[PDB]
Amino acid sequence: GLMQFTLPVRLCKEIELFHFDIGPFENMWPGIFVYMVHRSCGTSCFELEKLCRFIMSVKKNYRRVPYHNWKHAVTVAHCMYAILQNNHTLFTDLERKGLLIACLCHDLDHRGFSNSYLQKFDHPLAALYSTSTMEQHHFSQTVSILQLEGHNIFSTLSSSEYEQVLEIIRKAIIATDLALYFGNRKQLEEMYQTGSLNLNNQSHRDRVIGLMMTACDLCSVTKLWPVTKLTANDIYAEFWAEGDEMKKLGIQPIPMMDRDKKDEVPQGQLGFYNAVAIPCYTTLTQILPPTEPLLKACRDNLSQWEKVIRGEE
Ligand SMILES: Cn1ncc(C(=O)N2CCC2)c1C(=O)NCCc1nc2ccccc2n1C
Ligand SMILES: [Mg+2]
Numbered sequence: 001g002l003m004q005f006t007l008p009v010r011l012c013k014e015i016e017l018f019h020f021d022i023g024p025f026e027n028m029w030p031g032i033f034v035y036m037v038h039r040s041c042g043t044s045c046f047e048l049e050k051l052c053r054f055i056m057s058v059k060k061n062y063r064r065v066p067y068h069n070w071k072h073a074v075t076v077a078h079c080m081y082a083i084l085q086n087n088h089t090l091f092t093d094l095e096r097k098g099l100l101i102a103c104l105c106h107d108l109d110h111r112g113f114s115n116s117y118l119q120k121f122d123h124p125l126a127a128l129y130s131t132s133t134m135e136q137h138h139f140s141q142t143v144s145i146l147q148l149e150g151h152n153i154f155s156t157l158s159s160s161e162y163e164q165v166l167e168i169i170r171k172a173i174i175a176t177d178l179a180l181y182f183g184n185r186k187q188l189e190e191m192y193q194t195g196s197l198n199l200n201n202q203s204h205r206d207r208v209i210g211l212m213m214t215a216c217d218l219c220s221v222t223k224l225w226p227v228t229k230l231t232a233n234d235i236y237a238e239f240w241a242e243g244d245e246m247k248k249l250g251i252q253p254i255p256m257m258d259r260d261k262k263d264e265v266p267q268g269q270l271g272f273y274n275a276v277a278i279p280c281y282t283t284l285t286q287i288l289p290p291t292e293p294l295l296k297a298c299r300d301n302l303s304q305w306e307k308v309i310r311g312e313e
């Protein structure tokens, strides 16, 4: 009860910043997460014992893949932590509870393959879930782990509050399906600009939490350049393995996934910052001004990819 988590000084200060990197010491990541739940939510949100047992079962259900791994889960939760702490008064008690958990759980049991590869492989998950295949799986794994004995971190919520939090988590996890981000953001753009955006409207809150999920999920582009660049290596290690598997099914993969087209990475990064990242952080900053440092960091990394193309690195 009187048992705070505390971090060393450098981490205690830097964890508050959007560009914080959680570091290479895996054994400190659970403690970093609990620290974020305690300051974001309170020391009373969760029974420590249940929370710790939940976290460890979540870690166990992430796989040893280059990018969609336990470090990604914690990284995406830290970015959510930073958004929530810079917008103290905008979110409900249930939202603060749900969104850090959603982030920790959003890629549970990922195998390093896209929805597209599952559909072309004819994986069982693609018959069970026809759209947002992996994301419906991640939510499914979240509910499974919540139902293990001693893992119900929400046990003190009422029946209707429990239904509300599981519904926040569901929509938040589904929103990490990038295919859905394009329309969600267009709709948010029009609502903000015609001044119809209304945060008392539940369907509007949903869209804004969806955009936060995309922003947190992509947050490798908002780090200091050496973090961004070394994270890109892990991302391509998965993409190129998928490309290899596409070629095993007799299908030329898209160039993003073809290791024979490494030369095209720098131009593919510009497309991605211009088509996905910059628009994401722009609309996020319009709705939630204190998230501006994510947009600034993203623009700094786009300019670093521009230098790569010009052979200045
Ligand atoms: C940095 N980050 N964060 C997330 C993602 C991302 O896309 N996803 C889906 C799972 C997470 C990326 C990223 O790097 N995407 C790579 C973009 C890209 N590289 C190309 C190389 C050649 C041709 C086209 C290319 N495009 C579009
Ligand atoms: Mg995902």
Ligand SMILES: [Zn+2]
Residues within 6 Å of the ligand: 072, 076, 106, 107, 176, 217
């Ligand atoms: Zn993710």
